[PDB]
Design an enzyme around this catalytic site. Structure first.
Site, mmCIF file in Angstrom:
data_model
loop_
_atom_site.group_PDB
_atom_site.id
_atom_site.type_symbol
_atom_site.label_atom_id
_atom_site.label_comp_id
_atom_site.label_asym_id
_atom_site.label_seq_id
_atom_site.Cartn_x
_atom_site.Cartn_y
_atom_site.Cartn_z
ATOM 1 N N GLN B 80 0.963 -1.205 0.046
ATOM 2 C CA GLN B 80 -0.047 -0.154 -0.138
ATOM 3 C C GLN B 80 0.784 1.288 0.050
ATOM 4 O OE1 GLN B 80 -3.329 -0.005 -0.377
ATOM 5 N NE2 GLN B 80 -2.914 -2.291 -0.623
ATOM 6 N N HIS B 81 2.165 1.146 -0.214
ATOM 7 C CA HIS B 81 3.042 2.320 -0.212
ATOM 8 C C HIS B 81 2.715 3.419 -1.228
ATOM 9 C CE1 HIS B 81 5.479 1.178 -3.597
ATOM 10 N NE2 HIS B 81 5.086 0.000 -3.439
ATOM 11 N N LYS B 122 -3.451 -8.370 -7.792
ATOM 12 C CA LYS B 122 -3.817 -9.494 -8.769
ATOM 13 C C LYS B 122 -5.311 -10.261 -8.361
ATOM 14 C CE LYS B 122 -1.716 -10.387 -11.597
ATOM 15 N NZ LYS B 122 -1.729 -10.077 -12.946
ATOM 16 N N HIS B 191 -15.553 5.662 -14.371
ATOM 17 C CA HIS B 191 -15.275 4.869 -15.424
ATOM 18 C C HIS B 191 -13.648 4.794 -15.298
ATOM 19 C CE1 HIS B 191 -14.318 9.258 -16.549
ATOM 20 N NE2 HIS B 191 -13.522 8.849 -17.435
ATOM 21 N N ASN B 383 -5.334 8.732 -18.522
ATOM 22 C CA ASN B 383 -5.998 9.444 -19.508
ATOM 23 C C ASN B 383 -7.528 9.973 -19.004
ATOM 24 O OD1 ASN B 383 -7.640 10.408 -21.764
ATOM 25 N ND2 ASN B 383 -7.475 8.427 -22.923
ATOM 26 N N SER B 389 -9.249 14.215 -24.334
ATOM 27 C CA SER B 389 -8.555 13.751 -25.118
ATOM 28 C C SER B 389 -7.182 14.258 -25.294
ATOM 29 C CB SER B 389 -9.267 13.786 -26.665
ATOM 30 O OG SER B 389 -8.386 13.308 -27.666
HETATM 31 N N1 LIG Z 1 0.900 7.321 -1.201
HETATM 32 C C1 LIG Z 1 0.600 8.036 -2.248
HETATM 33 O O1 LIG Z 1 -0.728 7.844 -2.664
HETATM 34 C C2 LIG Z 1 1.646 8.872 -3.184
HETATM 35 C C3 LIG Z 1 1.432 9.049 -4.447
HETATM 36 N N2 LIG Z 1 2.477 9.553 -5.131
HETATM 37 C C4 LIG Z 1 1.976 9.975 -6.654
HETATM 38 O O2 LIG Z 1 2.985 9.216 -7.246
HETATM 39 C C5 LIG Z 1 3.498 10.222 -8.332
HETATM 40 C C6 LIG Z 1 4.902 9.994 -8.095
HETATM 41 O O3 LIG Z 1 5.647 10.874 -9.082
HETATM 42 P P1 LIG Z 1 6.965 11.400 -8.870
HETATM 43 O O4 LIG Z 1 7.223 10.887 -7.510
HETATM 44 O O5 LIG Z 1 7.156 12.821 -9.218
HETATM 45 O O6 LIG Z 1 7.965 10.700 -9.957
HETATM 46 P P2 LIG Z 1 9.444 10.930 -9.745
HETATM 47 O O7 LIG Z 1 10.144 10.273 -11.103
HETATM 48 O O8 LIG Z 1 9.701 12.311 -9.117
HETATM 49 O O9 LIG Z 1 9.602 9.784 -8.522
HETATM 50 C C7 LIG Z 1 10.524 10.177 -7.267
HETATM 51 C C8 LIG Z 1 11.031 8.938 -6.638
HETATM 52 O O10 LIG Z 1 9.842 8.098 -6.433
HETATM 53 C C9 LIG Z 1 10.120 6.532 -6.821
HETATM 54 N N3 LIG Z 1 9.198 5.594 -7.328
HETATM 55 C C10 LIG Z 1 8.643 5.832 -8.577
HETATM 56 N N4 LIG Z 1 7.690 4.814 -8.840
HETATM 57 C C11 LIG Z 1 7.685 4.100 -7.599
HETATM 58 C C12 LIG Z 1 6.920 2.988 -7.238
HETATM 59 N N5 LIG Z 1 5.972 2.321 -8.096
HETATM 60 N N6 LIG Z 1 7.343 2.274 -6.175
HETATM 61 C C13 LIG Z 1 8.351 2.891 -5.201
HETATM 62 N N7 LIG Z 1 8.959 4.241 -5.522
HETATM 63 C C14 LIG Z 1 8.724 4.556 -6.972
HETATM 64 C C15 LIG Z 1 11.272 6.691 -7.790
HETATM 65 O O11 LIG Z 1 12.337 5.610 -7.547
HETATM 66 C C16 LIG Z 1 11.851 8.187 -7.516
HETATM 67 O O12 LIG Z 1 13.003 7.820 -6.512
HETATM 68 C C17 LIG Z 1 3.162 11.640 -7.673
HETATM 69 O O13 LIG Z 1 2.396 12.264 -8.627
HETATM 70 C C18 LIG Z 1 2.553 11.573 -6.626
HETATM 71 O O14 LIG Z 1 1.167 12.049 -7.385
HETATM 72 C C19 LIG Z 1 3.518 9.819 -4.559
HETATM 73 C C20 LIG Z 1 3.652 9.742 -3.211
HETATM 74 C C21 LIG Z 1 2.959 8.956 -2.299
HETATM 75 N N1 LIG Z 2 -18.475 6.359 -19.526
HETATM 76 C C1 LIG Z 2 -17.595 7.481 -19.361
HETATM 77 O O1 LIG Z 2 -17.603 7.997 -18.104
HETATM 78 C C2 LIG Z 2 -16.322 7.598 -20.321
HETATM 79 C C3 LIG Z 2 -15.739 8.704 -20.343
HETATM 80 N N2 LIG Z 2 -14.869 8.911 -21.113
HETATM 81 C C4 LIG Z 2 -14.140 9.902 -21.207
HETATM 82 O O2 LIG Z 2 -14.241 10.812 -22.181
HETATM 83 C C5 LIG Z 2 -12.857 11.103 -22.733
HETATM 84 C C6 LIG Z 2 -12.908 10.960 -24.312
HETATM 85 O O3 LIG Z 2 -11.854 11.308 -25.095
HETATM 86 P P1 LIG Z 2 -11.402 10.353 -26.181
HETATM 87 O O4 LIG Z 2 -12.202 9.299 -26.164
HETATM 88 O O5 LIG Z 2 -9.822 10.173 -25.789
HETATM 89 O O6 LIG Z 2 -11.390 11.459 -27.299
HETATM 90 P P2 LIG Z 2 -11.280 10.696 -28.907
HETATM 91 O O7 LIG Z 2 -11.170 11.768 -29.954
HETATM 92 O O8 LIG Z 2 -10.253 9.628 -28.578
HETATM 93 O O9 LIG Z 2 -12.586 9.979 -29.077
HETATM 94 C C7 LIG Z 2 -12.584 8.509 -29.242
HETATM 95 C C8 LIG Z 2 -14.156 8.124 -29.930
HETATM 96 O O10 LIG Z 2 -15.126 8.484 -28.942
HETATM 97 C C9 LIG Z 2 -16.051 9.239 -29.662
HETATM 98 N N3 LIG Z 2 -16.690 10.171 -28.941
HETATM 99 C C10 LIG Z 2 -16.099 11.496 -28.535
HETATM 100 N N4 LIG Z 2 -17.148 12.196 -28.036
HETATM 101 C C11 LIG Z 2 -18.314 11.256 -28.070
HETATM 102 C C12 LIG Z 2 -19.622 11.705 -27.266
HETATM 103 N N5 LIG Z 2 -19.943 12.662 -26.979
HETATM 104 N N6 LIG Z 2 -20.562 10.721 -27.727
HETATM 105 C C13 LIG Z 2 -20.226 9.752 -28.095
HETATM 106 N N7 LIG Z 2 -19.122 9.286 -28.575
HETATM 107 C C14 LIG Z 2 -17.915 10.157 -28.616
HETATM 108 C C15 LIG Z 2 -15.278 9.693 -31.092
HETATM 109 O O11 LIG Z 2 -16.264 9.623 -32.073
HETATM 110 C C16 LIG Z 2 -14.191 8.691 -30.967
HETATM 111 O O12 LIG Z 2 -14.567 7.726 -32.216
HETATM 112 C C17 LIG Z 2 -11.834 10.474 -22.306
HETATM 113 O O13 LIG Z 2 -10.880 11.282 -21.812
HETATM 114 C C18 LIG Z 2 -12.374 9.573 -20.924
HETATM 115 O O14 LIG Z 2 -11.876 10.217 -19.970
HETATM 116 C C19 LIG Z 2 -14.258 7.834 -22.088
HETATM 117 C C20 LIG Z 2 -15.124 6.787 -22.123
HETATM 118 C C21 LIG Z 2 -16.139 6.337 -21.378
#
Ligand SMILES: NC(=O)C1=CN([C@@H]2O[C@H](COP(=O)(O)OP(=O)(O)OC[C@H]3O[C@@H](n4cnc5c(N)ncnc54)[C@H](O)[C@@H]3O)[C@@H](O)[C@H]2O)C=CC1
Ligand SMILES: NC(=O)C1=CN([C@@H]2O[C@H](COP(=O)(O)OP(=O)(O)OC[C@H]3O[C@@H](n4cnc5c(N)ncnc54)[C@H](O)[C@@H]3O)[C@@H](O)[C@H]2O)C=CC1
Ligand SMILES: NC(=O)C1=CN([C@@H]2O[C@H](COP(=O)(O)OP(=O)(O)OC[C@H]3O[C@@H](n4cnc5c(N)ncnc54)[C@H](O)[C@@H]3O)[C@@H](O)[C@H]2O)C=CC1
Ligand SMILES: NC(=O)C1=CN([C@@H]2O[C@H](COP(=O)(O)OP(=O)(O)OC[C@H]3O[C@@H](n4cnc5c(N)ncnc54)[C@H](O)[C@@H]3O)[C@@H](O)[C@H]2O)C=CC1
Ligand SMILES: NC(=O)C1=CN([C@@H]2O[C@H](COP(=O)(O)OP(=O)(O)OC[C@H]3O[C@@H](n4cnc5c(N)ncnc54)[C@H](O)[C@@H]3O)[C@@H](O)[C@H]2O)C=CC1
Ligand SMILES: NC(=O)C1=CN([C@@H]2O[C@H](COP(=O)(O)OP(=O)(O)OC[C@H]3O[C@@H](n4cnc5c(N)ncnc54)[C@H](O)[C@@H]3O)[C@@H](O)[C@H]2O)C=CC1
Ligand SMILES: Nc1nc2c(ncn2[C@@H]2O[C@H](COP(=O)(O)OP(=O)(O)OP(=O)(O)O)[C@@H](O)[C@H]2O)c(=O)[nH]1
Ligand SMILES: Nc1nc2c(ncn2[C@@H]2O[C@H](COP(=O)(O)OP(=O)(O)OP(=O)(O)O)[C@@H](O)[C@H]2O)c(=O)[nH]1
Ligand SMILES: Nc1nc2c(ncn2[C@@H]2O[C@H](COP(=O)(O)OP(=O)(O)OP(=O)(O)O)[C@@H](O)[C@H]2O)c(=O)[nH]1
Lengths: 497, 497, 497
Positions: B80-81, B122, B191, B383, B389
């Site tokens: 859970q880290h 898993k 979603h 995403n 998009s």
């Molecule tokens: N407990 C939580 O929910 C936490 C969530 N996060 C999220 O994770 C994201 C991490 O991005 P950054 O740390 O800025 O990237 P980063 O490239 O700055 O990573 C910084 C350090 O985190 C380590 N790290 C990266 N992925 C890891 C993993 N799966 N397990 C253990 N260590 C890992 C890397 O070795 C690196 O030394 C942040 O955007 C933050 O939002 C970060 C810290 C705690």
């Molecule tokens: N059920 C949900 O809550 C869902 C939410 N989403 C969100 O919507 C965003 C869609 O972005 P992308 O699909 O990456 O853009 P995209 O340009 O990759 O769109 C992919 C496909 O979705 C279709 N599409 C776009 N807007 C639509 C609408 N209002 N109604 C029906 N079909 C539509 C387009 O025709 C295109 O073929 C994603 O970022 C995702 O976060 C996506 C799928 C399901």
């Protein structure tokens, strides 16, 4: 003879299904074919048997010497046909998922045998409480609930922990306080998440002695049944016969006093260390002192150490109340007793049952005896779900209303026979004088327990005659258990599947 | 040689801790004694190793013939880290808690080797999808999420399921739809609870071929490293060497095409039925047709059936991509290959590793290769957590801004060399002409994957030289994995305990 | 001269309203009477001024010697026009609601002066961290969040704690871990509840040195403004002038290095013990060692103890960075300096301001200087709200796209001047070579901070000329602050009342 404890309880459930399966098709009112209906019954039986959820944990803790440890912890929720699900929390280095799964199953049937609205559950922790600081047990118990709560395994709507082996009111208070202050803060039913709490924290009079009364009212409901005592060849009564106790702990302790106060002479007692054998009676008060003074029932200068296990001691009523699987195929040939009550949970292996039926000795199922503890922890969970000291609303009122029944009777008579003016004094007795103000908190417990284990003893007798199970009350118990849980699945439209 | 699959992965973790333990004390900055610091390290290592949660289920289902069944289902959350915790959902009659616990562990390290913010997880289901109606698989998949969700094992803040063995985009859509419409209805991130969804349901370009590219960019990052190819005695390049594939499924399939398009000649392929051996190359398009036409890779008239397992086939790059423990102590002596890539999860027993190091054949850890699939399912979970998009906001803008860089350069030159008035035509190339409007959705995938598995391949090389692990890149991988998860526990003040 | 610290900040707000009130009626577009509009402005100003919530706590704790204590703890949320509300957590035996209320107010304006989306907040704990075990500080910090969280004062949607006096990254990790594991477990934004976390727990490069850079970029944005240096009578530049530091802690420390690396010669430094005066410069590296070796800046053998307070030391740039109300009516007559920067929060009493304006010495408001720390803790709260290492998605992509701009320019020229075939080598510089792969995590920090405190310095200059406030930049700061928070209340239809 040491089956997987879950394969054993399943084994009892099996012989239960083998007899109900016929009398259960005819009570199924759906419109299908005979064989089809049986393909419906056997199916539902395969749904009851397994556990629906078996969580499994691991705890980083910081012992007082700063070192870390992991602590495997388990919790099973056998069935969901009835929410919430109660179940104790056991601390022992011998707990495992294979054990918890079965103990979880039993309480699904215990609660069904005594008609208490709970599914089954059980939680274990691989731990030895005799090793850890009374600070470490807090950091362990609080973490164990923090983990469960966030995954939906504690809360008055899902699960309700309870005391069990190596846990008491001390632990159950740490749980209720952790849950109330972290997860269910806003919930009005926060403190109702666990039972077995201390009185000042929302307990019930006699939650400790609750299980003992169970073992008592159970034995009483059978000893005073001549239909069996004529078979066993004994006498209805207690002062005329004796009994022994395995596991002087909570069950064994209070199983003594409540069975000691009515002439039954507790011969011996034992524990993990050794036995204390006196064929003339052991004062449950005095021995209780040494458990708080000398750490063990040994050294008790009004008895002697016994070179042998309790299970072979000559007595009239054997009560294993210490652990599982104690009686077995190797101990069954040397019981030398008449009735084997059961405080512990499944202390008898299924192989030893035939030997006991063969030796013509009645075995009272643990489903029925230690079910008293549940039926009181239900009153607790139900006490602190209503937020009122039961009966407080109508103490001064019932006391008045009764003083107007007796008065009206008096005033009515002083008009028919009152020609002489003679003051008819309709006044309560000694007994009624206690029950004037109504039902106090302790009264419903001493009754609701004695009543719950009255209906249950009948439904077991009523079944063992309907199917001619003789002295295998155990099988008769599961029959009543299975028939009840079945009607829940049957009518529920079991799933959305 | 068939260890408990969880005792095996633990075994790798062990050799990892045995080398890091020294270089990790010196990086611990607390103020204690040397031995104390080691009593701190070993402790945290005992916290990482085990799984923090292993749920276990049972499903009443109604098959189309009306009969009921139970369906054991599992889910582990290793650590859970780092929340949430990703992990596939496998359907196979060979799944068990002893398997899931380990596969759960691997993804805690996979995600650590490729720097992806997820704990491991898993989920398995004892089931054979080849037996059940495509209606029954829906009633099973939806019930399996209904059970998890109510117990806090699905949701964009806790766990994120993903495709795995015998599951595809079909199943992952049933999950996202059940969760969105029952539990997380109000949640804006509903979603986003699962990855591997269909594109129309919020997927990512090439989520299917994602893992294949992983196996590709992994092999490429090593084949094009002469420091090892000088040891293995081969040539940096693909068209000069061949490879085989175990398990023609998703990984094996797309491992071919991406490795087939660059001259590497896929010799053979096999599955649960049999092998298809052709030392001259199999068209991944044509064979893909028969999987949709003839139900098996057998019968493929441009090759022949092979009386033998793929693992012994003479080739240059062996890729087991079908199941666990395939290579073993009995298959290691007869590999006859040079490099053993790994699409499957731990397809090599630890005993066979020494034989492979002894036979001087490089084994690329599965921690590194099939980690591509995760790093794309991360982009998906990321995403549909931003609701846009990617790159749509700045298509017309980047296209303009770039047309003003090139213009400004032109206008600037037409003042220095523009004395002749000659119109300098600064115009994009063919390649840049594609990247004008910026980064589309598919571009970041084909890059973010090729980049993530660039940094990772270095950190593994950079470690295997620092500690002189030669060709045991696997051990070098765990070292980088353990060092990362350690700094999380170390600094977190591990517990409130 | 020791006003109630809340009556003081109110006093500044007052002089702010006294000047805006006119230029704010004319920008009010509602249709009312002149006097009415003023009866509307003054009213909204009375709503801004007070704090909207001031919680107050009491903690039962168990010290390691088993004794209990109570721990008063406070938290104010000044305004709600902008959620969430950030604010540090201070540990000092001198904290009170009368202090917290004002510090809470400042951060409502700090965040308004530098255009950061947060309301103000602040939390105190009457405690002396130098007294308690590093276990007790955990039991205190975790309990302090347990209390706030259940009453809605922590959480990424309401409040975001941060480091402050006598707290560091050690404490902020205990908070994020307690909140994530108890209240906001399911929430996807759990870990984003606090800023100032360690990097491994989701921090930001240079969160510690963040505030120092603030003090630096602030001073730089004015020293390099001749319009004032012509008035103050000094020279735009750092290596030509010196500065001193009060409070060698986090602000004072990093205020040195970033201002030491550019020639400015740090004369002296002091703390609760005493002063360390050297008119030739103190190495911020060497002195930093003694804070980790000798417990105090005293004993520093490359300087001497100074029988006097820093605030009277002859220098060029005074920086009080230790506590509140240090400069006052009794210290103002003996400053002997030119510019008084402010790292601490309101270290100058309003009485001393007139004396400073009278002595013709420019005071840079703390609203502007220590606002750097916020603008970086905003990037943190915004980093771990997007769940991605900023810029990771487009490292390999930008690196490619830039290699196609430069290539296209080359290929374009090799057609105009390429008649000779001469290979024009368009290649990056040394500087650009770093910025090829795009904006890494540290780059946006060193820029977003230097940029945020560029716009702010202008809006303050742009105001102090519009209203002719001379060197009272402080009053000019509040004007920009009040004008911004006003337009939020004005247009919001302030209440449903
Ligand atoms: N407990 C939580 O929910 C936490 C969530 N996060 C999220 O994770 C994201 C991490 O991005 P950054 O740390 O800025 O990237 P980063 O490239 O700055 O990573 C910084 C350090 O985190 C380590 N790290 C990266 N992925 C890891 C993993 N799966 N397990 C253990 N260590 C890992 C890397 O070795 C690196 O030394 C942040 O955007 C933050 O939002 C970060 C810290 C705690
Ligand atoms: N059920 C949900 O809550 C869902 C939410 N989403 C969100 O919507 C965003 C869609 O972005 P992308 O699909 O990456 O853009 P995209 O340009 O990759 O769109 C992919 C496909 O979705 C279709 N599409 C776009 N807007 C639509 C609408 N209002 N109604 C029906 N079909 C539509 C387009 O025709 C295109 O073929 C994603 O970022 C995702 O976060 C996506 C799928 C399901
Ligand atoms: N106490 C309760 O509230 C309830 C108890 N039970 C059952 O009653 C049984 C005992 O009651 P507890 O309160 O758990 O007692 P307890 O928690 O006081 O401990 C039982 C005692 O028996 C002794 N003992 C344990 N294993 C033994 C062995 N193999 N041989 C000899 N002595 C042994 C131990 O020294 C211990 O002091 C348990 O097995 C439990 O399943 C069932 C329902 C409620
Ligand atoms: N933390 C919580 O939320 C708790 C709530 N409760 C609820 O309170 C109700 C109490 O009823 P009973 O205890 O059965 O009545 P009771 O007459 O049995 O009271 C038992 C003891 O509680 C003490 N007590 C009563 N009111 C008190 C108060 N306001 N402050 C401190 N001590 C007090 C009495 O002195 C008495 O010794 C229960 O129904 C339970 O539902 C009970 C315990 C803890
Ligand atoms: N597909 C994915 O998204 C990911 C897959 N993996 C790993 O890749 C491996 C295979 O990829 P999947 O997509 O699961 O393939 P899949 O789900 O298409 O099935 C694998 C194929 O291999 C064949 N196979 C299975 N066991 C076999 C055995 N003992 N001998 C010969 N053939 C056998 C089966 O016929 C099946 O068609 C899995 O073990 C999984 O651990 C890992 C990460 C992601
Ligand atoms: N450090 C930060 O992240 C931020 C700090 N600030 C302001 O900066 C000021 C100092 O920064 P901190 O990080 O709190 O430093 P700190 O927490 O390291 O402690 C300040 C140091 O100044 C010394 N000191 C305290 N009171 C003193 C007095 N009356 N006379 C002489 N020396 C004294 C103490 O020995 C202490 O080591 C604080 O007052 C705070 O208001 C503002 C925003 C962010
Ligand atoms: N350990 C222990 N518990 C006792 C003893 N006596 C009573 N108790 C428990 O404490 C509660 C208070 O006892 P009482 O005041 O006599 O009320 P009670 O329910 O009439 O007691 P009993 O009829 O013996 O159950 C009882 O319900 C018992 O459960 C004792 O001697 N030792
Ligand atoms: N099963 C299967 N999938 C394919 C095939 N060709 C492409 N795909 C997948 O469908 C997606 C669309 O393919 P394209 O339009 O060519 O886009 P692409 O990412 O450039 O394709 P690739 O470079 O081959 O990965 C690809 O990302 C592949 O993952 C194919 O022949 N068979
Ligand atoms: N206490 C302390 N912190 C430092 C020191 N040097 C750097 N740091 C902090 O650690 C971070 C890592 O430093 P660097 O690797 O040099 O990166 P940086 O941001 O370019 O460093 P600076 O330009 O000095 O801010 C910096 O952002 C500083 O905030 C130091 O000498 N002492």
């Amino acid at each position: 003879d040491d089956p997987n404890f879950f394969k054993m309880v399943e084994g009892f459930f099996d012989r239960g299904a083998s007899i109900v399966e016929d009398k259960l098709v005819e009570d199924l009112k759906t419109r299908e074919t005979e064989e089809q209906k049986r393909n419906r019954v056997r199916s539902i039986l395969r749904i009851i048997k397994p556990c629906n959820h078996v969580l499994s944990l691991s705890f980083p803790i910081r012992r007082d010497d700063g070192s870390w440890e992991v602590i495997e912890g388990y919790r099973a929720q056998h069935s969901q046909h009835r929410t919430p699900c109660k179940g104790g929390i056991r601390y022992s280095t011998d707990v495992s998922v294979d054990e918890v799964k079965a103990l979880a199953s039993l309480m699904t049937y215990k609660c069904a045998v005594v008609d208490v609205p709970f599914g089954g559950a059980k939680a274990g922790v691989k731990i030895n409480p005799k090793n850890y600081t009374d600070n470490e047990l807090e950091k362990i118990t609080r973490r164990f609930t923090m983990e469960l709560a966030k995954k939906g395994f504690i809360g008055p709507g899902v699960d309700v922990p309870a005391p069990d082996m190596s846990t008491g009111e001390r632990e159950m208070s740490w749980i209720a306080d952790t849950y109330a202050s972290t997860i269910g803060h806003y919930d009005i039913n926060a403190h109702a998440c666990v039972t077995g709490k201390p009185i000042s924290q929302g307990g019930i009079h006699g939650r400790i002695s609750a299980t003992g009364r169970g073992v008592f009212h159970g034995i009483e409901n059978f000893i005073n049944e001549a239909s069996y005592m004529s078979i066993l060849g004994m006498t209805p009564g207690f002062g005329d016969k004796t009994f022994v106790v395995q596991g002087f702990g909570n069950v064994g302790l209070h199983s003594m006093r409540y069975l000691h106060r009515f002439g039954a002479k507790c011969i011996t007692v034992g524990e993990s260390d050794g036995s204390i054998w006196n064929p003339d009676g052991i004062d449950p008060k005095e021995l209780e002192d040494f458990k708080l003074q000398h750490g063990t029932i040994l050294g008790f200068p009004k008895a002697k150490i016994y070179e042998g296990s309790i299970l072979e001691v000559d007595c009239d009523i054997l009560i294993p109340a210490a652990s599982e699987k104690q009686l077995t195929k190797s101990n069954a040939p040397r019981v030398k007793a008449k009735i084997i009550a059961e405080g512990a949970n499944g202390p008898t292996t299924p192989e030893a049952d035939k030997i006991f039926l063969e030796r013509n000795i009645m075995v009272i199922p643990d489903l029925y005896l230690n079910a008293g503890g549940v039926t009181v922890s239900y009153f607790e969970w139900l006490n602190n779900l209503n937020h009122v000291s039961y009966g407080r609303l109508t103490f001064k009122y019932e006391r008045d209303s009764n003083y107007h029944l007796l008065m009206s009777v008096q005033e009515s008579l002083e008009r028919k026979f009152g020609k002489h003016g003679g003051t008819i004094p309709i006044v309560p007795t000694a007994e009624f004088q206690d029950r004037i103000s109504g039902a106090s908190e302790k009264d419903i417990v001493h009754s609701g327990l004695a009543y719950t284990m009255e209906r249950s003893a009948r439904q077991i007798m009523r079944t063992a005659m309907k199917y001619n199970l003789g002295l295998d009350l155990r099988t008769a118990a599961y029959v009543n258990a299975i028939e009840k849980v079945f009607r829940v699945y049957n009518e529920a439209g079991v799933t959305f599947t």
